[PDB]
Amino acid sequence: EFETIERFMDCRIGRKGATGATTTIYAVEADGDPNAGFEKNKEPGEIQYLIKWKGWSHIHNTWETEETLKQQNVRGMKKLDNYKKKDQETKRWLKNASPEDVEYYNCQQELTDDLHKQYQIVGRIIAHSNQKSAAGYPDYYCKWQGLPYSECSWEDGALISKKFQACIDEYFSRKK
């Protein structure tokens, strides 16, 4: 019925309207980053968030504003309050911080950042649909890098060939 929020993945200041379906990685690749030429300079922006939608997989992460979360009558809005609360607590005990703490925080906080971006490439395909679409695509059973095998999904076969045809090739070639 209504969307739900599972995790808040990152935060950012970005172009006004760089929120919504058009901000997923496979739209930005197939269409273009609405948030393209942004230095935070040259252009006033907005606080946008990176949402991991309940039900859907880490590839459908879209960026939204507080407004669009409310405008979309989405569930999980308390999660929005906590993410903002613990962000203020984290900025607090890093204002009085030795330079080597900022070294740690920025080194670390950037490892999790990669690890998160890897949750979107497909580690191996595992199955496919009997049914095909009008356009002639099965749907695929993807395993995602970093995420365990219980983080697998039935993914659009038209969708994943655009970036992982090679992973589709090796599924079929490990039969004959």
Ligand X SMILES: COc1cc2c(N(C)C3CCN(C(C)=O)CC3)nc(N3CCCCCCCC3)nc2cc1OCCCN1CCCCC1
Window of 6-14, 37-45, 54-62, 87-95 that interacts with ligand X by CB under 6 A: 54-62
**C-alpha 144: how far from chain center:** 13
Q: How far is the CB of 67 from a copy of itself (least distance, A)?
A: 19
Q: How far apart are CA 138 and CA 158, in angstroms?
A: 8
> Is residue 48 within a helix (H) or strand (E), and if so which, with residue range?
strand 46-53
Q: Which residues pair with 51 in a beta bridge?
A: 8, 62
Q: Judged by CB, which is closer to ligand X: 8, or 156? A: 156
Q: How far apart are CA 127 and CA 138, in angstroms?
A: 10
- Residues between 100 and 119 that touch a copy of itself (CB under 8 A): 100-101, 104-105, 108-109, 112, 115
- Residues between 18 and 47 that touch ligand X (CB under 6 A): 20-21
Q: How far apart are CA 118 and CA 123, in angstroms?
A: 9
Q: Does 56 bind ligand X (CB under 6 A)?
A: yes
**Interface with ligand X (CB under 6 A):** 3, 20-21, 53, 56, 60, 62, 72, 156, 159
